[PDB]
Design an enzyme around this catalytic site. Structure first.
Site, PDB file in Angstrom:
ATOM      1  N   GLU A  16       5.365   6.063  10.185  1.00  0.00           N
ATOM      2  CA  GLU A  16       5.612   5.236   9.176  1.00  0.00           C
ATOM      3  C   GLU A  16       7.187   5.156   9.586  1.00  0.00           C
ATOM      4  OE1 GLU A  16       4.530   2.291   8.563  1.00  0.00           O
ATOM      5  OE2 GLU A  16       2.507   2.450   8.175  1.00  0.00           O
ATOM      6  N   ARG A  17       7.910   4.392   8.506  1.00  0.00           N
ATOM      7  CA  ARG A  17       9.337   4.097   8.540  1.00  0.00           C
ATOM      8  C   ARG A  17       9.947   5.345   8.098  1.00  0.00           C
ATOM      9  NH1 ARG A  17       6.811   0.197   6.458  1.00  0.00           N
ATOM     10  NH2 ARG A  17       6.426  -1.816   7.376  1.00  0.00           N
ATOM     11  N   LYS A  77       0.840  -1.206   0.047  1.00  0.00           N
ATOM     12  CA  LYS A  77      -0.187  -0.089   0.019  1.00  0.00           C
ATOM     13  C   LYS A  77       0.991   1.200  -0.024  1.00  0.00           C
ATOM     14  CE  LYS A  77      -0.815   0.176   4.955  1.00  0.00           C
ATOM     15  NZ  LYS A  77       0.034  -0.748   5.552  1.00  0.00           N
TER      16      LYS A  77
END
Ligand SMILES: Nc1ncnc2c1ncn2[C@@H]1O[C@H](COP(=O)(O)OP(=O)(O)OP(=O)(O)O)[C@@H](O)[C@H]1O
Ligand SMILES: Nc1ncnc2c1ncn2[C@@H]1O[C@H](COP(=O)(O)OP(=O)(O)O)[C@@H](O)[C@H]1O
Ligand SMILES: Nc1ncnc2c1ncn2[C@@H]1O[C@H](COP(=O)(O)OP(=O)(O)O)[C@@H](O)[C@H]1O
Ligand SMILES: [Mg+2]
Ligand SMILES: [Mg+2]
Ligand SMILES: [Mg+2]
Lengths: 460, 56, 474, 462, 125, 154, 125
Positions: free
Chosen positions: F27-28, F1
């Protein structure tokens, strides 16, 4: 009168403080509002002369520091003949708009169960006057019957007949406890009760879903108290209908949640067993009379292991399962003869003749339901030669279980038919033996005795 | 050929009859396994909610 | 000193004062209701009401008795119906008692006990046959709703007539309809003479249900300490546990697996430990326990069933499959076990019935694939016939136990193969008439009962008498 | 010295208030209860010079404001050779009678586990006699062995066989620790110990079901404390047997609630990992001595995801899982050959043939388990000829793992047959290669050697 | 009350419940199954009941209710669905298996029920 | 995604005109630099504004970072009036940050241990992300699905 | 920081979490799902994020992290296993269905992914 004052209000629950005297548990309280007085029920004592209560009606309007009147007794309800053919509130008030009640006796809703020596220790079989039930699902005096039904499968018709059959058949009176009743289906019940003319031969007690959880809990007991009177005071048998018992069970957990108790397995009340037992132990057969009970049971997620039906099944003596398949086929009453079961079906209870008939009837009916796969697709022709003679009996047996009903007179036109046990046994006993093999199956449809079955074949 | 195909379908009747019976009983056990977990899943859910509130 | 109630609800109470009150001390509330002092906090005392908590409220006085919670135990109780507290239920006057014994009492040590010797005979052909019970053993009766669980329990009480054994059927979370009909049946057959009935029914408060089994075994202790043999029957524990669960959750004790508290094991473990056979040093008495447990759709790997299985000395499984198929008592031999074994069993019994257990287990596996092979081995076909016949013998009716002498012959018939030529249909009556033949004529039944072994002579003597009956039969 | 008074009592926990000095944690307190005295153990320091204590015996009778005295040290026990051949209490008392103990030295229950570098690395197996174990999950000398089993799947029976195979005819010292199991088993064992004559060398400690929570908690230690003494003081290799160690961790949960700790998953104590580590790491083979521990683990509701059995897995060199499916199928010992594993099963230790054969049967049994779904609904006839032979062999191998037990001789009515490691690997090899395809599967149950398997096949023919 | 016929549509009660849940849990009211208060059945009952037909005496008007409820992976046994089903007079069960198959509206006849039934149909129908 | 968002940017935002706004919500951080690398080489960087508050950041950051990136986009649609593309990854982490703190703010936990004001907290932020009469924004917001369970509240 | 490559290994974070659970529930920080506290994601988020490769400006020194997780009967829906999977740059799945089948190391290619891909591979590979 001992009087107190409100301390705090949180939706359904209300805490109340008294100065002088403190009311015992399950005592009815009353607060005065311009509209109507609200009845509360004290549950526990907290401290500082304060007690917590659950309201039987809405609390939208109550202020803090209002006057409250201790009745000093658990909510009492009127009993006797004044109740017959009247719609009763949980508090014993009338809601059918049929003037006031003039009852001459009042019994409290909360009371302990019959003691050990009082109970009649004998398995007296009860006949409803219906073939399928009395034979395959025999009722017991002071018993608890499971009414697995719902939807248009002729449930209310079966109930109205069972009420009419005990009233006419024996010196008995029925009671109906609408636990979590639909206001729509309440009116329509009272409607069809007067239509059929059974209204007089029963008592109606509704506790609608509309009302709070406190109401739905105790309404089950209201009707039970009315039934308690007819057994205790008068020396006659009683028939106490409950619908639905799960709505009593679920009302309990709803209350337990509000009071803030720690929920037990599956989120039901911790006092699931006792609260269930307190009601069901009251329903039994004394030496003076007997309260038999037909209770409808909801089964969450079609799960029997679920605690609500599981703890209920503890008390149940027999079960009567209405099938839509049989209702669609055009056989009334439906009553699946295989699903329906009873404690009373044994030689020790009913007799050797009654037993072996019922067994053979079911074994043949089962053998037909096995060969239902073939005849439905292929046909009666495309089948084994030896089984076809036993299948031809089975189809007649199933159609013979159909029964003209007195309550149905208004609709069907045909006159009703009560049938005792000895009349049925002979009828079924002859069919499986193969005396009336030459009689067509269409003759058996909606006929009383086997005597009338053979009579209708010539008529046709 | 008539005998063989007559036998074929009579043999297929047997294999499928037992297959249906095996399936029927497998469905039963699984339904109980499901409800076992259903019950557990509801209990646990409440334990966590009550456990969180009571800790507060 | 003394106390007063400052808070109450849900069968739990908070009491002010009580300076010199001790842990688990019996209390006395007004209107005759009583309780057990539980939580001795700094500023207050906790109490579990042992009765209707409605009759008690805030303000009401409470006086500590001075003694620990205890049940009135005596020899007058024999033939009476009792409640958890010890009051008379039956309505046959008051109860004069010798001793007052405590409900909660640690079980005996290791050296205080000895291995069981003498058997306790239920009087059922299947049970005493291949899953024997000893006096001091703890054997579970596990099954679904209505599989003849209580039936086996009462049939055991029946057979204890004329063996000098007292009986205690404690009814936990039952209905009085059941308890009363049991009292009526036992008194009619004349087995109520030597039987006590403790009752904490579904109507009664949970603490009374919690108390009942402990009261039952405490009365059982009375006879054991003197030096007699007792039978106790917990009917049932799966209701008992729920009763305890109700309490724990209302006491705000954290819930565990299936909402049951952490010490639901210790609830039953410490209870059943009190049922054992003492050494000769302490007088060679015994308390033999038959607890019952009610599984939901044969879920024996549930929390409580496993708890109870892990504390008992074996179990007796009862399937609805067998029961509804028309085989009562519906005992599953393949699964059911008794850990004591042949230590407490008659020689004669072990000679005939020992072979059966395994044969039945195999028998069922042979039945399953009998569907497939349209034809099958003829040696194996004989085993099925034997299996059909031996099973019909193991089937017996209710309220009719057999003596050991009658059981011995019943097995000898089929296992030796004197019934092989007899048809399966009329196998039940063939047994009945044969024992009646041996009763009056040969009186070989009394020979077995006294001897309690089949020797070279009596074994051939038995084979002669049956050969006569074979010819006589028409 | 250090005398206090009881403020409040709560079932198995008692709160005591000291005027002057306050006792350190794990200290032993004593109260003069009616006739006999009761021993308590201090746990927490609350405040206002008050301490929360867990009782080692029933608290029924205790009044508020009773006197109580501090010993100063923890609960110390008679330790050494004096205890051998005598059953001991949680407190260290003799409950066998036969005079008082000849105790010379003493040692406290609570003591820190052996630090790193005091430990020793030893990876040598020893044949148990049991075929399934010796092949697949061989136990390790000076190792921690685990016997996982549900309610009544033959885990106590298995112990009784292992003590009978190992501890019976060997010179080493033994230790047994009864923790929250049957008191019947206590008398049964004590009798079988004396009559066999193993009693002399072995030492027993007991705190069974009847005992309150506090007792069942600490008994696990006292027996271990005794076992520690022999590897330390004497410097001698000892065997430790426990049944059941779960009941220790179980007792924790009963107490934890009362100590006021916030419950974790499935209403267990939140310090489950450390409370168990503080024990399990203490049961280990040092340099000074060597302990071979074989402890049984009860699995509640056959649920191995349960945090009590779940966490124990990470304290074991070899693990033998007992499955109900196997027991129900009518096979004993009911050992799952796939779920059971041992650290020692490596070419390094067991050699080539042992390892090669062990992995092969696993591969076969795995394939049988894979196809078991399809067979259940359809049948054996459908699966391919390639699979057909592997399934038939699997069912034989599975049933061959069964063998009669010496302890269960009275039960089974068969001479329990000890099979050496070398003859097992011989058997499973011959069966795998397909040299016993002619033999029926009903000639492998409760046999032992493969030589006896064929003898049973000939016995049929007659 | 003015004798007119009304139609009302709640879209949806599953969102409504969650809104009431928030209030209760923030008011520190004791939670139940799926963190809902005890009076969540009572909440919906007193709403839905208030939609019905009066008698001729009281005007003859009516309020017909079309409540909607969202199920998660066809979970009808969940706390709100199960109890809202229990209240209503009938139920219209939709299925995505039918929807994806091309059936519109994706209605399941077999399980769909109307306890009123024939009473609310003209002879022709 | 995440890869899918990256492609949608590569296809839409690169080719078409107008500004855009990426919001790295919890997120990362690796992926942050990986985007920033592709952004500058592609030359999209000039026509886009990046707001970040990744895994490594505490609860409060991961909570209110979505509002920062949103407020940047709000300005561009109303004040400026240009076409806006709002990319968010991941809008679950907003809720997650809420749940972490929720417990310590004295909130009783709701179904499957979320904050009891899950719907309104989300609703307050989501309703704010929209096109209006004065200008339109195209919101492409990735949503995590705990254990592939769509019945999960989030 | 000095500009050297590191390979840290956490064995294992599933146990690490339980320790943090112990701390929290004793400190009276309230429980969440599976009794774990609020920030058991943040616990492993800040730890794993710490592993990275720095730019050439700060040395170019790396620190590769291989965390380990212990599933319960292949249950990856569990709270911590799912947490860690979403943090890392891919994962490696081991199934006993392969391990017992005689496929070592028992890696499931289907579920196992590396979010760096061929970027971290020699051209020949
Ligand atoms: N050995 C038997 N032979 C014939 N009938 C039996 C036998 N045992 C029990 N029954 C019948 O089965 C019925 C149920 O038996 P029983 O009540 O003992 O089972 P239960 O499991 O105790 O029931 P419950 O769980 O409802 O208390 C009884 O009505 C009895 O007549
Ligand atoms: N090795 C075995 N051989 C034969 N039967 C066994 C064996 N192990 C156990 N059993 C049977 O199973 C029962 C359970 O044994 P036990 O060790 O008490 O299990 P647990 O300790 O797990 O409760 C025994 O009574 C016996 O009948
Ligand atoms: N368009 C694509 N083509 C091929 N593989 C893809 C594609 N998108 C994702 N993947 C695979 O999935 C991984 C990246 O998934 P990711 O975008 O991180 O999903 P999520 O955001 O749900 O973690 C890569 O390692 C790659 O193997
Ligand atoms: Mg019973
Ligand atoms: Mg054991
Ligand atoms: Mg991503």
């Amino acid at each position: 009168m001992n009087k107190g004052t409100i301390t705090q209000i949180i939706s359904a629950v209300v805490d109340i403080a008294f100065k002088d005297e403190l009311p015992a548990i399950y005592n009815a309280l009353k607060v005065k509002l311009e509209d109507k007085e609200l009845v509360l029920e004290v549950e526990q004592h907290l401290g500082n002369n304060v007690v917590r209560t659950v309201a039987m009606d809405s609390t939208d309007g109550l202020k803090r520091g209002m006057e409250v009147i201790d009745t000093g007794k658990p909510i009492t309800i009127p009993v006797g003949k004044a109740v017959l053919g009247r719609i009763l509130n949980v508090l014993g008030e009338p809601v059918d708009n049929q003037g006031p009640l003039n009852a001459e006796t009042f019994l409290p809703i909360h009371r302990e169960a019959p003691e050990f020596d009082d109970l009649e220790t004998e398995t007296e079989i009860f006949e409803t006057g219906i073939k399928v039930i009395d034979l395959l699902a025999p009722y017991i005096k002071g018993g608890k019957i499971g009414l697995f039904g719902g939807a248009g499968v002729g449930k209310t018709v079966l109930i109205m007949e069972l009420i009419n059959n005990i009233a006419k058949g024996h010196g008995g009176i029925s009671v109906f406890a609408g636990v979590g009743e639909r206001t729509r289906e309440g009116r329509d019940l009272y409607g069809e009760m007067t239509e059929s003319g059974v209204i007089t031969k029963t008592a109606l007690v509704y506790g609608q879903m509309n009302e709070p959880p406190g109401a739905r809990l105790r309404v089950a007991l209201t009707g039970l108290t009315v039934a308690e009177n007819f057994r205790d005071k008068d020396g006659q048998d009683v028939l106490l209908f409950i619908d639905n018992i799960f709505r009593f069970t679920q009302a309990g957990s709803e209350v337990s949640a509000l009071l803030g108790r720690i929920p037990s397995a599956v989120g039901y009340q911790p006092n699931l067993a006792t609260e269930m037992g307190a009601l069901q132990e009251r329903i039994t057969s004394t030496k003076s009379g007997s309260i038999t009970s037909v209770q409808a049971v909801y089964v969450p997620a079609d799960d029997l292991t679920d605690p609500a039906p599981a703890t209920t099944f503890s008390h149940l003596d027999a079960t009567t399962v209405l099938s839509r398949n049989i209702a669609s086929l055009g056989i009334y009453p439906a009553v699946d003869p295989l699903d329906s079961t009873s404690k009373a079906l044994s030689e020790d209870v009913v007799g050797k003749e009654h037993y072996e008939v019922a067994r053979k009837v079911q074994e043949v009916l089962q053998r037909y339901k096995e060969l239902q796969d073939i005849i439905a697709i292929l046909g009666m022709d495309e089948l084994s030669d030896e089984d076809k003679l036993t299948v031809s009996r089975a189809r007649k047996i199933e159609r013979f279980f159909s029964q003209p009903f007195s309550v149905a007179e208004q609709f069907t036109g045909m006159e009703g038919k009560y049938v005792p046990v000895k009349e049925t046994i002979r009828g079924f006993r002859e069919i499986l033996e193969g005396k009336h093999d030459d009689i067509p199956e269409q003759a058996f449809l909606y006929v009383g005795t086997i005597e009338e079955a053979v009579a209708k074949s010539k008529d046709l | 050929i008539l005998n063989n195909t007559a036998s074929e379908h009579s043999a297929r009747k047997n294999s499928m009859s037992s297959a249906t019976d095996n399936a029927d009983e497998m469905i039963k056990t699984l339904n109980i396994k499901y409800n076992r977990n259903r019950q557990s899943a509801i209990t646990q859910e409440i334990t966590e909610i009550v456990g969180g509130a009571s800790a507060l | 000193t003394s106390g007063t109630v400052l808070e109450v609800g849900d069968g739990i109470a908070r009491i002010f004062g009580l300076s010199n009150v001790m842990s688990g001390e019996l209390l006395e509330f007004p209107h005759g209701v009583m309780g057990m002092a539980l939580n001795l906090e700094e500023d207050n005392v906790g109490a579990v009401i042992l009765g209707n908590a409605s009759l008690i409220k805030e303000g009401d006085e409470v006086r500590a008795t001075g003694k620990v919670v205890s049940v009135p135990a005596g020899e007058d109780l024999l033939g009476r119906v009792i409640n958890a507290l010890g009051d008379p239920i039956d309505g046959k006057g008051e109860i004069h008692v010798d001793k007052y014994m405590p409900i909660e009492r640690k079980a005996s040590g290791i050296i205080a006990r000895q291995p069981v010797s003498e058997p306790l005979q239920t009087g059922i052909k299947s049970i005493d046959g291949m899953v024997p019970i000893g006096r001091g053993q703890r054997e579970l009766i596990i099954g679904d709703r209505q599989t003849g669980k209580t039936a086996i329990a009462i049939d055991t009480i029946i057979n204890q007539k004329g063996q000098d054994v007292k009986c205690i059927y404690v009814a936990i979370g039952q209905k009085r309809s059941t308890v009363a009909q049991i009292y009526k049946k036992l008194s009619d057959l004349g087995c109520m003479d030597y039987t006590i009935i403790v009752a904490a029914t579904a109507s009664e408060a949970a603490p009374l249900q919690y108390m009942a089994p402990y009261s039952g075994v405490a009365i059982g202790e009375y006879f054991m300490e003197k030096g007699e043999h007792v039978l106790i029957i917990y009917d049932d524990l799966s209701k008992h546990a729920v009763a305890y669960r109700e309490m724990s959750l209302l006491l705000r004790r954290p819930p565990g697996r299936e909402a049951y508290p952490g010490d639901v094991f210790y609830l039953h473990s410490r209870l059943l430990e009190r049922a054992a056979k003492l050494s000769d040093e302490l007088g060679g008495g015994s308390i033999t326990a038959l607890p019952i447990i009610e599984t939901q759709a044969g879920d024996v790997s549930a929390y409580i069933p496993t708890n109870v299985i892990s504390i008992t000395d074996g179990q007796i499984f009862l399937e609805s499959q067998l029961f509804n198929s028309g085989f009562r008592p519906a005992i599953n031999a393949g699964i059911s076990v008794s850990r004591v074994g042949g230590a407490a069993q008659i020689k004669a019994m072990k000679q005939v019935a020992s072979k059966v257990k395994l044969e039945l287990a195999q028998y069922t596996e042979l039945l399953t694939f009998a569907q497939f092979g349209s034809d099958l081995d003829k040696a194996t076909k004989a085993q099925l016939e034997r299996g059909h016949r031996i099973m019909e013998i193991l089937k017996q009716p209710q309220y009719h136990p057999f003596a050991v002498e009658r059981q011995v012959v019943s097995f000898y018939i089929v296992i030796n193969g004197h019934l092989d030529d007899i048809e399966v249909s009329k196998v039940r009556r063939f047994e009945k008439e044969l024992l009646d033949y041996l009763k009056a004529n040969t009186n070989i039944l009394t020979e077995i009962a006294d001897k309690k072994a089949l020797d070279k002579d009596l074994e051939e003597k038995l084979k002669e008498s049956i050969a006569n009956f074979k010819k006589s039969f028409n």
